[PDB]
Amino acid sequence: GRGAPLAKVVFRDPYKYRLREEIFIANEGVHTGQFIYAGKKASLNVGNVLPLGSVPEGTIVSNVEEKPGDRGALARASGNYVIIIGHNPDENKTRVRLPSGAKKVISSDARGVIGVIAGGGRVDKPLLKAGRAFHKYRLKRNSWPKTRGVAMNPVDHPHGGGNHQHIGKASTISRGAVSGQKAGLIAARRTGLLRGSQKT
Amino acid sequence: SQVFGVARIYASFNDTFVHVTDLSGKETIARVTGGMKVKADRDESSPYAAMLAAQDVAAKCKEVGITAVHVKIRATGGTRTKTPGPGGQAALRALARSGLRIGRIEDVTPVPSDSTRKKGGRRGRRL
Amino acid sequence: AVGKNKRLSKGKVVDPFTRKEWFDIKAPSTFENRNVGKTLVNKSTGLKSASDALKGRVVEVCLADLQGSEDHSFRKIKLRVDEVQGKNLLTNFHGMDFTTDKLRSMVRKWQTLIEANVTVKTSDDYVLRIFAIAFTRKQANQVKRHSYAQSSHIRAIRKVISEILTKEVQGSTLAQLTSKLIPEVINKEIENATKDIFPLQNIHVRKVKLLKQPKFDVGALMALHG
Amino acid sequence: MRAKWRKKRTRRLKRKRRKVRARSK
Amino acid sequence: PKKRASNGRNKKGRGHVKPVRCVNCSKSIPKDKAIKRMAIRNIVEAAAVRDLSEASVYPEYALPKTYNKLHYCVSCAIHARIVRVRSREDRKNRAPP
Amino acid sequence: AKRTKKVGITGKYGVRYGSSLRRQVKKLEIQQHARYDCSFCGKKTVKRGAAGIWTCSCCKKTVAGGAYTVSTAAAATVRSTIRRLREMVEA
Amino acid sequence: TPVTLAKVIKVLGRTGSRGGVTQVRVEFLEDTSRTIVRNVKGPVRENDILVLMESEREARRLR
Amino acid sequence: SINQKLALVIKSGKYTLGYKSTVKSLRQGKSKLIIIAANTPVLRKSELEYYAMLSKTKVYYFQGGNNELGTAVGKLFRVGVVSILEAGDSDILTTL
RNA sequence: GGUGAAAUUCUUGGAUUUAUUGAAGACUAACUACUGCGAAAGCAUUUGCCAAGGACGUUUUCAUUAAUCAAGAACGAAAGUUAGGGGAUCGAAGAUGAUCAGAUACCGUCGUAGUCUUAACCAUAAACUAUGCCGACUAGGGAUCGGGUGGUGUUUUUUUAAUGACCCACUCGGCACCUUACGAGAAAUCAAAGUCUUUGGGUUCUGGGGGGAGUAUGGUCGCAAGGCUGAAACUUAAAGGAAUU
RNA sequence: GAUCCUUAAC
Incomplete structure (x- = not known):
């Protein structure tokens, strides 16, 4: 159900004689038998777990924390990464750019794995097959197949019913709409094909 | 005792920015440009309007209390025309007539080493 | 555009100098x-x-002003x-530069222009990118x-210029670099190293850029003991 | 009539002929 | 017929040279066909020379001069009158006034 | 002989799914089924286990890589950028 | 209103599309060796004294 | 350069390819140069460097993996380490 | 901010001027030339690695191994196509302000594809020197690039044992320039477009009034756009080249 | 910057 490989990596317990085994999101280039270095003093190498205050601008990070200690939230999907936009030491914070293109200021103590995540290019290949889609969602969850609401009865959906399959009312739904109404394009600022780019 | 700022003249086309800053550049004094002196839009780069803006700047910076100014004059530059506007000739004369002492005049127009791409198209501006 | 702006404020003065004050800026001991x-x-x-707002200001100053000499006028x-x-408040070396007029005056056609550049780290942990220009002359x-x-x-x-620059920086800290840059010992040294290859006049060193700042200066040399 | 635009017009005609023949095929 | 044995440019043994954009219209012209003129002027425009000399803090100041090579296209060169049409036998003169 | 003109590995899909989709699937499937050079033991024994997992049969090392290639262009760009920043930091 | 009385020393030729002005060289009675170039709408001879409100202009051409 | 002198050794000198023969020659003390590929296991590099420190044998790290080292030594197979027993007409021993 | 003038747009939520910076992508100015290399397309930051090349010099080797070439191939600006990456600038389409009798144009402000790169296609340009390649001979002159040769010629090591860069002449090989006409040509002009009615050095390709028409059809290559091959029916007395006032 | 056009040849 995950596009990216995971990395079984073992550290030593600093306080007791015992090995501690961790679950990492494998960055592209990590291999078995590779030493990785987690800490604020580590080098800027792929797989290391520097804080953002320790990495410089332009750094590719992944598995970045939102707050220091939540053990990774940002840029965890296959092939995704976070860009270190900039720093400010006073009121220690770091501006970063997220995979969606959004900028976020988060504390400089939050950690991340240097590099990009393995499994990149996954959505490049067309499934070609409802069977491939079936096996893809069989491990994820029960979200497939998707019946169109226009193809159902008015009891079952806002879009259902009619002598022709059509929505009837505008398919853009307001944010303040209630459950049972939020079917279609929720809070759509605009619709239709964009003759444009992301424009981050 | 001579305390000096830096002139920072921008003699673009259709505009003449004149504003004196400190020797560091981080603190600015008297940011006046041709528009604030001339009403008609076609004369924001007129020599008269640039002279007026420059003398206004000179009065403000002398009443702030600096005696000398090192001149740094600049055209639009980069990709653009690189030929300074009438303000370049008008403003320095305006400061000299005001009587603010002048030193170390230098052209600081930003030239590119292999500029990105000119504007106007391959056939250019077919006016 | 005095009367062109339809609105000056979309949402709807105290003179800065009164809240502002002067500060005095000094150079290192090499000038x-x-x-x-x-x-x-x-x-x-x-x-x-506001001391923190001061601690991050950079001033370009003419070498002619820093040396009282007209022949240094084309360097800053x-x-x-x-x-x-x-x-x-006292500063430190940040970088040297030329004047655009001097560069464009020294650049002429019907001759060859040679450029070299190095990225050498000094012995006091400073990392300097040095650029050296050179021109050919008719004998x-x-x-x-x-x-x-x-x-x-x-x-x-270019090879000999690069190795002269690297050898000079590798063996002198920043202060020695400034104190040997201002008499321009490099120019005659490199002309001596080059003259058996091609005449090559106008061998000034162009701008130089820094990357570092010093530490908290507590015990022996130039900043507090008095 | 510029030769380049006449060439373009002939390509337009060629495309239309090929379309109608593809239909009739 | 062939107006100019040089094809109105300077290309013999090249085939292709990198173009340069014009300064008036920003036309993309070949460099050999451009009409480059070097502009070298005093910054003060020579009418305020004495004014700036007396207003300067340093006597015997150099009064620096600006430099720029300036590229023209064939269309704007004739309009700007940096070049003009000449006689058929007068087109062969290669030297400047 | 040359058994197929252009469908190559995608001859298994026969006629269905559309020529363009089969073309893209060809381009990615040759990559995902090719053997890659192991940078450790130096011999072409790196195969894809699953999307992102690339095992070497001889040196018994698994590398984390692209879904259909052992390494992606974005990964190489990231490696170069990280190297440049690291070297700049050290000196 | 401060005015400057300056005498014309050189006539440089009629200037403008219609020739309604002449480009002239004017030297001030005070601060001699300060020379300026201006335009005069009428005809001018030598030893001709011109009263001007503001001396801070150069008039090079008119087209 | 380095591949040129290695080829000269191959033409004139005597050499052994491979870690086992390399370690044997290091033990018997008759090897003079060791050339170690770039991608050979670093544990093997440590072992060979220890053997060479014991033997007082010069070690040179080839700027290339076993494939390129084999190509430089003239063979069509991978070579992780090559010990030059003598060169004769090559100055490979004296230099580097 | 732009413009002849404006306007679209951004502004007591400071991009639009400065100081420090940081990032991205493209680009490689000035030096830059009647200069260089490459078969052409084309190629201009430093260094390294890889293989290649012209010219020169040779009292080196082989000895006709050569010239051009249907078929058949390699490379081929830009735009364009497929899909990744990239996507700063400029910008087919489009939005929009102006001009205008109209303006789905020029002008102004944005802006998707594109511009960039990887893999695969495409195979066209005024791809021009509108001049096929090889070989020989026929005027002069200076300049320039690369190589070589000669000169009690010029300057710094160390004016003392080696030399670099210059100066003079010669030569080979180039990119090219001035004049007449030996000649040529319809002329413009041409050291080749000369040595062709005093007609023959070798060889390849192409044309036969203007259209219809690079169309139709049949092949063939391409994902497509299209490329290559390529008519006829019919129509027309001119269409064209170079110079004169 | 609007200065768009000219009952048909001889």
């Missing part, structure tokens, strides 16, 4: 002139402590304020019109 000028700052309110030096102590008694270089002279010249 014959110490004072370089004055600078406005906001008043050091306890919430803000960036001085970065790094230490503030009581209205006599006396020459009748040829242009006096270009055969692109192997250019390569050997």
